[PDB]
Amino acid sequence: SILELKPLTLLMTSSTSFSETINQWADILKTTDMEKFSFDSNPINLLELVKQFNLYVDELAITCEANNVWATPNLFALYDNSGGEAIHGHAFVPYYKESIVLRRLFTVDPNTFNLSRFAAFEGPCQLYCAAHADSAWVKIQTLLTLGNGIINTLKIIKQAQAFGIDEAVTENLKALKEQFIAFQLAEADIKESLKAPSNKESEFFYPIDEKALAKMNGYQLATICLEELNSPKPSPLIERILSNKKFWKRINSAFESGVFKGRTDDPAGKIAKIREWHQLLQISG
């Protein structure tokens, strides 16, 4: 009777958040003898996982901000070698709040083949990590990296099963279990750094003094403008920039270079908006 067991499965119906999901799945694999079972990955819904994971990334970013970790430019300013050039629609801006970099770096985007990328920060973040092994950021990165990896291990398992490749499913189940244990460990390590808890111009950038703003090239000034339009209302930062004539030629030239058309947040709509605001503000200073 019970002697002939049905395939083990991991479901999502009991959970709605990413941490819970991984928790349920970890308790199941930790509590199963990895020799007696056959697996069935079909019920795993990767789109739902990613939806949960992305909400998880967002929430983490919110908490890090509220609890004021990252406690003047950001942690990555010192490791920029781009020379202000634009990569994939963004130029490195040393005043990006690291919670924003966190959201861009670790959010899984279907547009970019389900990869999580922030090209202009990949270099500086790698250098920073190598130089601050025990930092809060590295614990955040370890965490979200394991999360990302869990998602990809599940894709590998699902593809292997569709192709009828059995060994590729069982070795990855062990890897999957190890990743669960690592994820939960990283999660516990972060709960400590969040510890206890407790910007006018912008939600996305630290304060930029007039000296530092003037040093910016067009690509940088433009990514700032493009970013500020993510606020529901016109921010003091973008008004400061578009109000001052000395910035316009740089910015508009960056726009004309075409370097922002790959963006997926409606660059055309935004550039039209920004140009319109510029016209508005240059009627009478």
The count of C-alpha atoms lying within 13 angstroms of the C-alpha of 235, restricted to the half-sphere facing its C-beta, is: 21
* Residues in a beta bridge with 8: 39
User: Where among 153, 174, 196 does a domain terminate?
Assistant: 196
Return the closest-CA partner of residue 218 out of 243, 245, 255: 255
Which parts of the chain fold into alpha helices (H)?
Answer: 18-30, 46-66, 98-106, 119-131, 136-162, 167-194, 210-215, 218-228, 236-243, 248-256, 267-281
d(Cα 201, Cα 205) in Å, to the nearest integer?
8
d(Cα 224, Cα 205) in Å, to the nearest integer?
8
Both 253 and 264 in one domain: the answer is: yes
Sign of CA dihedral 150, 12, 115, 162: positive
Beta carbons of 37 and 177 less than 8 angstroms apart: no
Both 145 and 244 in one domain: the answer is: no
Sign of CA dihedral 133, 177, 163, 54: negative
Domain count, the chain: 2
Both 159 and 280 in one domain: the answer is: no
Amino acid of residue 131: A
Beta carbons of 237 and 202 less than 8 angstroms apart: yes
Q: Which residues are within 8 A (CB) of 205 and not within 5 positions of it... i.e. 6 or more apart?
A: 93, 95, 96, 97, 199, 224, 227, 237
CATH number at residue 156: 1.20.120.1700
Both 31 and 122 in one domain: the answer is: no
Expressed as residue numbers, the domain containing 30 is: 1-71+133-196
Return the closest-CA partner of residue 21 out of 12, 30, 32: 12
d(Cα 107, Cα 43) in Å, to the nearest integer?
23
Both 213 and 178 in one domain: the answer is: no
104: annotated binding-site residue? Answer: no
Both 139 and 270 in one domain: the answer is: no
The count of C-alpha atoms lying within 13 angstroms of the C-alpha of 125, restricted to the half-sphere facing its C-beta, is: 25
User: Where among 170, 196, 222 does a domain terminate?
Assistant: 196
Both 283 and 145 in one domain: the answer is: no
Per-residue burial over 44-73, b = 16 or more CB atoms within 10 Å of its CB, e = otherwise: bebeebbebbbebbeebbeebbebebbeee
CATH number at residue 88: 1.25.40.830
* Tokens matching residue 226: 């493009």
Both 212 and 277 in one domain: the answer is: yes
Output the CA torsion 213→219→224→226 (10° steps): 150
d(Cα 212, Cα 89) in Å, to the nearest integer?
21
d(Cα 58, Cα 106) in Å, to the nearest integer?
9
The tokens 């433009």 sit on which residue? 222
Both 1 and 45 in one domain: the answer is: yes
Both 83 and 190 in one domain: the answer is: no
CA angle 59, 61, 67 (to 5 degrees): 100
Beta carbons of 102 and 60 less than 8 angstroms apart: yes
* Residues in a beta bridge with 39: 8
User: Where among 149, 165, 196 does a domain terminate?
Assistant: 196
> Could you tell me how many residues make up the chain?
285
Both 225 and 284 in one domain: the answer is: yes
Both 77 and 203 in one domain: the answer is: yes
At residue 90, the 3 state secondary structure works out as strand
The tokens 């020379």 sit on which residue? 83
Beta carbons of 220 and 87 less than 8 angstroms apart: no
Return the closest-CA partner of residue 115 out of 50, 39, 180, 178: 50
Give the distance, in angstroms, between the CA of residue 146 and the centroid of all CA atoms in the same chain.
13
Give the distance, in angstroms, between the CA of residue 152 and the centroid of all CA atoms in the same chain.
16
